[PDB]
């Protein structure tokens, strides 16, 4: 059960039917220069660190 | 939908790649490169003789690989397998064609498209159908924004293209023609023949399609692969 540590670099905005989810552009601690866009449940700012059960999934961006 | 089978068997394991071996495809002399690719088939058992399964196969390869230069980027080429010579199965020409993305980029609105086809026959009893395509050009100092043809220039241009294709194929066998089309001299002729009618930028020819084959005559094919 490997995991991945990823660093938030820029928040996009709220998303979801009820505004309880946040879109963030997060950047991996290891093997840098790769940025992915993921959804976050709870309160979050920039510069936080997330742990991911998997890395290969890019959430549906609304822009 | 993994568990969706109500019934898997109307009435009521072996790895297949341990039985399969590779083969190297060879192109005729009229190409800068000769090494095309590699292909898989089963054991040529006493009941199959896999050379039979290879006899009527067709492989599509981009021309840019065959010539090295990237200007022939789109330019698909179709090659037909004909003879198996010790893991170096041989191929000859079967058809040329354009790539959809290019073909669609050819056609834009606010200009006139001109198309023509022909069913000429070669000296080698080969029966070929060749297609040609053209679009009108707005010259420098153009002010009007559409630049259409007058439907009689189109008739003349199509007549010229039709006759010139025949006069370029009659007498020619096949390979000269292949080496005429690799440097695209045919379309080079078109504007020289039509510049007194209408501009006609961008006169790439089209796909070419084969229709009828004569008897095999192994020796001619062997001549291409020295």
């Amino acid at each position: 059960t490997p995991v991945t540590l990823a660093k938030v670099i820029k928040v996009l905005g709220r998303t979801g039917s009820r505004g309880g989810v946040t879109q963030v552009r997060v950047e991996f601690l290891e093997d840098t220069s790769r940025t992915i866009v993921r959804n976050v449940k709870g309160p979050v700012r920039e510069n936080d660190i997330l742990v991911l059960m998997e890395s290969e999934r890019e959430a549906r961006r609304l822009r | 939908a993994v568990g969706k089978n109500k019934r898997l068997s109307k009435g009521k394991v072996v790895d297949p790649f341990t039985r399969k071996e590779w083969f190297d495809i060879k192109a005729p002399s009229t190409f800068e490169n000769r090494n095309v690719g590699k292909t898989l088939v089963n054991k040529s058992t006493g009941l199959k003789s896999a050379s039979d399964a290879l006899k009527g196969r067709v492989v599509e390869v981009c021309l840019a690989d065959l010539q090295g230069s990237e200007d022939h980027s789109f330019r698909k080429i179709k090659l037909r397998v004909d003879e198996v010579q010790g893991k170096n199965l041989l191929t000859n020409f079967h058809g040329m064609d354009f790539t959809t993305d290019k073909l669609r980029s050819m056609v834009r609105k606010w200009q006139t498209l001109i198309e023509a086809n022909v069913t000429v026959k070669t000296s080698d009893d080969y029966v070929l159908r060749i297609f040609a395509i053209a679009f009108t050009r707005k010259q420098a100092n153009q002010v009007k924004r559409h630049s259409y043809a007058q439907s009689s220039h189109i008739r003349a241009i199509r007549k010229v293209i039709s006759e010139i294709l025949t006069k370029e194929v009659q007498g020619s066998t096949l390979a000269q023609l292949t080496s005429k089309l690799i440097p695209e001299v045919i379309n080079k002729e078109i504007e020289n023949a039509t510049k007194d009618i209408f501009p006609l930028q961008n006169i790439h020819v089209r796909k070419v399609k084969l229709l009828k084959q004569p008897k095999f005559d192994v020796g001619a094919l062997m001549a291409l692969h020295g």
Partner: protein, 97 residues
């Protein structure tokens, strides 16, 4: 009363226009009345371009295009967040955005 000068199409002097089929609901609609759009889009993305470019042979290959024309019925066009509506006098405006 009359709502548009062309009455919703571009037919003046024809009578019949040889209709086509909507791409979404397959409703029949005259060609000129249709709401044709041109969809030119690069094949992959604006995101995975870096991945494919580095993980591909032929450096700086082509990244070619893709071209589809779309035809929507009036109802589908409105329902798919396109040109939806405009105000009374603003409807006369012809130019694109």
């Amino acid at each position: 009363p009359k709502k548009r000068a062309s009455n919703g199409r571009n037919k003046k002097g024809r009578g019949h226009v040889k209709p086509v089929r909507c791409v979404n609901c397959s409703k029949s609609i005259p060609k000129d009345k249709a709401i044709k759009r041109m969809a030119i889009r690069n094949i992959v993305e604006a995101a995975a371009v870096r991945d494919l470019s580095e993980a591909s042979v032929y450096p700086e290959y082509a990244l070619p295009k893709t071209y589809n024309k779309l035809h929507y019925c009036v109802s589908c066009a409105i329902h798919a967040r396109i040109v939806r509506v405009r105000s009374r006098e603003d409807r006369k405006n012809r130019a694109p955005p």
